[PDB]
Structure 1
Amino acid sequence: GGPMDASVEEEGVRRALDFAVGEYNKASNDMYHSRALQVVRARKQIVAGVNYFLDVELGRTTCTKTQPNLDNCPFHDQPHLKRKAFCSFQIYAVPWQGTMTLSKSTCQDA
């Protein structure tokens, strides 16, 4: 944990750089190819995380976002207010740093 100095002298780094430049040129609206003039700084860090893959049915509750006690709030009962959705969430957790990132989320109606 914690980025250490690295350089273009290393395989992984040169490959990462060429990949990065390739993606940059791929995403740009420029008709011209851009290329690396110089690497001003390079660092590398081994990281680990835990992916949680959750398939979850969500229900619409009767509570608005502006109010308390949402975690046990009743689900809508009335015909046109009821909304349900089946969702797939991928959460990338890094317990060492106390963070979570939502890597993927798609939802389809019930």
Structure 2
Amino acid sequence: QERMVGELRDLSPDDPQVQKAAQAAVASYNMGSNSIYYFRDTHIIKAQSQLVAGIKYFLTMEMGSTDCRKTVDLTTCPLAAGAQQEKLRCDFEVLVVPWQNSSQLLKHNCVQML
């Protein structure tokens, strides 16, 4: 066949390739979001991969708003507390291809947590 569609498989949330895919998702989400502040990953809850012509990562993760405003090393950005605190739970689909340096966030659906 012409198409390459591999098996969908569970990965460890601590797989270094999941982690890189996760930082790709965060960076892209922050670029596209209307929020004043950068969000930052707090927990990878679930991770799956699928071999295509390239690799898809399907990530479920939680994010927290930071004190860092956009107007980047997120490890230096504290999670906001009290009035500015906001938590999201997101599904991300990330595309990784060996000929591109930047991994792409194909889809995302985020949801504000109480």
Instruction: Output the TM-score relative to the length of structure 2.
Output: 0.48
Q: Which has the larger radius of gyration?
A: 1
TM-score, structure 1 normalization: 0.49
